[PDB]
Symmetry: C2
């Protein structure tokens, strides 16, 4: 879905591709224009978060589907924030899809292909070299990001169901939001109909992925995508 | 492995059986005298913890393989403390069996047969009705229990690799250690040889289960079991 291209010690290129993968690599397809949409939406979200005082790796656009991003010492984590029950949570808590959580859930996943990205807690993280203070800072950022995105999206008739973040550390030792923010990494439901406007359309053949991602883009920007 | 028999609102009978189960019920066998050993060892450990100020459900012995225990509102948790890498941890962190942890790991598991007892974090626990203060108290108790047991066992040439606890709440709202403490619920390794003196002998056919459990009993008591 994405390619990283080194420029120097300070920055690199993050390039969004049209490739889509699901179910641990077993499902694959290419969607023309997906890269452009995910790149554009990431930029929109990064800029919004920066305005709200969230440090992100976003530096600038490099034309096409390319972003210039800050080089970081990456944490081997995927940080998932969940507002509504969906996806893997249904296999952890006996709650139905669509269940409204009384407060957000934050889950930490250890990025490790061989172990298939298992969930971890604060004690496992410490063994991996991540201090409890770092973990607390990471979850604090993720929860603030959640508030900003959910509020922003709700005013555009979209329910932020859940989303996945990655983080790294900059040269000052500050924790910086990295990776992407897109319909690939978030669950987005229409507020009126509850239908998926995200990667679940591809995961479960709910319709046309490109049309769903365009709809998100159009609702957010107020204009049709130019590509 | 165990049966619970209600007496009244204050207490019940916890009875230890000779049955052994492994790998989610797929492996079964009966070991003559296992119930007696697990009952006796639980009593020994409960008494030791009580002397060190740990609240446990232990009230008294009711002859044979029967303990009288306090009735509690049980938490739907299994709390696992790990000092040495073994078992399921090898599938979560890329560390070898026998790896010495820099500090103990505490894992919370949601007791739910349908979901196969998935691991959970503090956020999932809150959704299940368990406050962060309760979770903190539970882990504090578990970590203290760990120190007491590991110190006690090391002076008898046994390495406490890991163990599993359950807890409930008494009528005063205090958090009380429940279930059992035995070679069924702990990993015990000989300090000299590193060989299993616990349920792993049954799990992986490492030898005679009864002989292993007797050895633990003999090392702890200083005398051969009478049954």
């Amino acid at each position: 879905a994405k390619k990283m291209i080194p420029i120097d010690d300070d920055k690199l290129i993050m390039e969004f591709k049209d490739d889509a993968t699901a179910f641990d690599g077993t499902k694959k397809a290419r969607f023309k224009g997906k890269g452009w949409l995910n790149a554009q939406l990431s930029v929109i979200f990064f800029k919004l978060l920066e305005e709200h005082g969230i440090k992100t790796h976003f530096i600038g656009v490099a034309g096409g589907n390319r972003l210039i991003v800050e080089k970081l010492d990456m944490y081997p984590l995927e940080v998932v924030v969940r507002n509504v029950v969906a996806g893997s949570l249904k296999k952890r808590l006996p709650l139905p899809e669509g269940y409204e959580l009384p407060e957000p859930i934050v889950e930490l996943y250890y990025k490790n292909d061989e172990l298939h990205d298992p969930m971890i807690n604060y004690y496992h993280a410490k063994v991996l070299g991540i201090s409890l203070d770092e973990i607390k800072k990471i979850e604090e950022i993720a929860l603030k990001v959640n508030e900003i995105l959910k509020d922003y999206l709700a005013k555009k008739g979209i329910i932020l169901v859940d989303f996945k973040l990655e983080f790294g550390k900059d040269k000052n030792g500050d924790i910086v939001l990295a990776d992407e923010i897109s319909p690939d990494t978030c669950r987005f439901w229409d507020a009126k109909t509850k239908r998926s406007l995200d990667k679940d359309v591809f995961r479960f053949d709910k319709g046309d992925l490109i049309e769903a991602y365009k709809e998100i883009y159009e609702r957010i920007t107020g204009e049709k995508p130019e590509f």
